[PDB]
């Protein structure tokens with residue numbers, strides 16, 4: 001299995017799935033480095049974020065548990081196909097990159113917070129992470145290049 005993938009057992013169906021412990025993504029299909037990648041993200045902050053404030057809300061009061069529930073809802077909607085990643089990043093990300101549909105541009109290792117960096121370089125082009133935790137809050141990451 002590629003970097004970070006493990007074979008897991010679905011609790012509800014008993015069917016096997018695959019989980020990546022670097023990106024926190026899960027998928028049913030069996031999964032099949034560059035100097036820089038380009039990623040967008042959607043950030044949900046909470047009261048324990050390093051800065052519990054965002055361009056969108058002066059005082060962020062939601063709990064970390066509430067932020068994870070929000071993130072998990074956005075992931076469901078994006079995976080369902082009902083909403084594009086860009087649409088939810090623009091509307092709900094607590095990062096000013098929201099106004100660029102979540103795009104952070106290109107970057108190399110050594111620039112971003114480490115769990116974000118590691119998830120970004122372990123994603124395939126076009127792939128989306130699961131919930132990724134940093135000191136800023138909880139991220140959904142989409143690798144675009």
Ligand SMILES: *S(=O)(=O)c1cc(C(=O)O)cc(C(=O)NC[C@@H]2CCCC2=O)c1
Nearest residue numbers: 008009010011017018024026027028130
């Ligand atoms: S597993 O069954 O313990 C499991 C763990 C997580 C997680 O902790 O992130 C997520 C999922 C999950 O996404 N289940 C639904 C489907 C499983 C295959 C891919 C899915 O969308 C399961």
